[PDB]
C-alpha cells in the first residue's frame, strides 16, 4: 500500500506499468542518474523482459531487497 503509492505516483499514464521514461522522471527526483545506470536497474526489475515494470515485479523486487527500501 505504501509500495502502491510510489508506484501509482510515477505511473503517469495510468496503464499500470512503469516505462523507462517514467522511471527516468522518477529517478530525477531522488537525484542525478546516468542513462546507463537507469538501463541497468530497468533490466533488473523487469523480470519477464517485456520493456515495462508491472506492479507485481515492483513489489517482488522491494521485499526481496529490503536494504534498498
Amino acid at each position: 500500500d505504501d509500495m502502491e503509492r510510489i508506484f501509482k505516483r510515477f505511473d503517469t499514464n495510468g496503464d499500470g506499468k512503469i516505462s523507462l521514461s517514467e522511471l527516468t522522471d522518477a529517478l530525477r527526483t531522488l537525484g542525478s542518474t546516468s542513462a546507463d545506470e537507469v538501463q541497468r536497474m530497468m533490466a533488473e526489475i523487469d523480470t519477464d523482459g517485456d520493456g515495462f515494470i508491472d506492479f507485481n515485479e515492483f513489489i517482488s523486487f522491494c521485499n526481496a531487497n529490503p536494504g534498498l527500501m
Epitope: 516505462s19 538501463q39 541497468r40 533488473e44 523482459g49 517485456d50 520493456g51
Partner: antibody
Framework: QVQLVQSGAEVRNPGASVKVSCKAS????????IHWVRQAPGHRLEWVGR????????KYSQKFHGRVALSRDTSASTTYMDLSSLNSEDTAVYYC??????????????WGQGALVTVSS | QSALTQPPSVSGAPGQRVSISCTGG?????????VHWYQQLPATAPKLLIY???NRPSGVPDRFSGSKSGTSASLAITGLQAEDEGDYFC???????????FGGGTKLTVLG
C-alpha cells in the same frame, strides 16, 4: 559501435549438445540483457531465452522443455547458450541480441552475426 | 491470436512503394505492446529497422515508415531500391505466453 561476435559453426549428432558463445563490446555489458533467437531454415525467428548479464537470472521459452541453458561471464563480456539433447529440428542459426530500453518499451537493437548449428546424421 | 501473421512475400518495381502488414492479438498488440520491425538482407543477421511502431534508428531513411493499431501493424517502404531486397519481420511481446514473438517474415523482391 555496439557489437556482438558469436562463435563459429558447429556440427552435432542427434542426442549430443552444443555451446555457442556471444562476446559483447562497445558498451557496458552488465547494464543490458542479452536475448537469444534461433532461425530454422525456412522458418520464422524463434525466441530462445533472456539472461540478465548482471544478476545473472535467466528466462527460457517453454518451447524447449528445459533443454536450453544460458550463462554469462562478465570478466570476458560473453554469454553462452547450451542446448542439450539435440535433434534435427534444432538445426538452425542461433543469434544473440541486446535488449535496449526506449521510452515506451524495449527493442533488440544490436544482433550478432549468427552461429549455424547442424544436427545431422 | 497469440502470434503475428505476415504475408509471405511482396514485390514492386524500383521507385514504387509496397506495404507489409502484421496482424496481432489482444495478448500482444492489444495488451499495449509496441511493434518492432527487423530487416534481414541476404546473408546477414537481422538489423533493427523500426522500433516502437514508427521510430527509426540512426541510419534508416524516412522511406521506411510504420503504423500501428491495437490489432494491426503495417510497414511502408517508398522509393524501392535494389538494396532493400530481403526479409522483414515484425516483433512484439505476448503476455499470455510471456515471451517474445516474431511474424513469419515477408520476402520483399525488387523486380529486375
Amino acid at each position: 559501435q555496439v557489437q556482438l561476435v558469436q562463435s563459429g559453426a558447429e556440427v552435432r549428432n542427434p542426442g549430443a549438445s552444443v555451446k555457442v558463445s556471444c562476446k559483447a563490446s562497445g558498451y557496458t555489458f552488465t547494464s543490458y540483457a542479452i536475448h537469444w533467437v534461433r532461425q530454422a531454415p525456412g522458418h520464422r525467428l524463434e525466441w530462445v531465452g533472456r539472461i540478465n548479464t548482471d544478476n545473472g537470472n535467466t528466462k527460457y521459452s517453454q518451447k524447449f522443455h528445459g533443454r536450453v541453458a544460458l550463462s554469462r561471464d562478465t570478466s570476458a563480456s560473453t554469454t553462452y547458450m547450451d542446448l542439450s539433447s539435440l535433434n534435427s529440428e534444432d538445426t538452425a542459426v542461433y543469434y544473440c541480441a541486446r535488449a535496449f530500453y526506449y521510452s515506451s518499451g524495449v527493442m533488440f537493437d544490436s544482433w550478432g552475426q549468427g552461429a549455424l548449428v547442424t544436427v545431422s546424421s | 491470436q497469440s502470434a503475428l501473421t505476415q504475408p509471405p512475400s511482396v514485390s514492386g518495381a524500383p521507385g514504387q512503394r509496397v506495404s507489409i502488414s502484421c496482424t496481432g492479438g489482444s495478448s500482444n498488440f492489444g495488451a499495449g505492446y509496441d511493434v518492432h520491425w527487423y530487416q534481414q538482407l541476404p546473408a546477414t543477421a537481422p538489423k533493427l529497422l523500426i522500433y516502437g511502431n514508427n521510430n527509426r534508428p540512426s541510419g534508416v531513411p524516412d522511406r521506411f515508415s510504420g503504423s500501428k493499431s491495437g490489432t494491426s501493424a503495417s510497414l511502408a517502404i517508398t522509393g524501392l531500391q535494389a538494396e532493400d531486397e530481403g526479409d522483414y519481420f515484425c516483433q512484439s511481446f505476448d503476455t499470455s505466453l510471456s515471451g517474445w514473438i516474431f511474424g513469419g517474415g515477408t520476402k520483399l523482391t525488387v523486380l529486375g
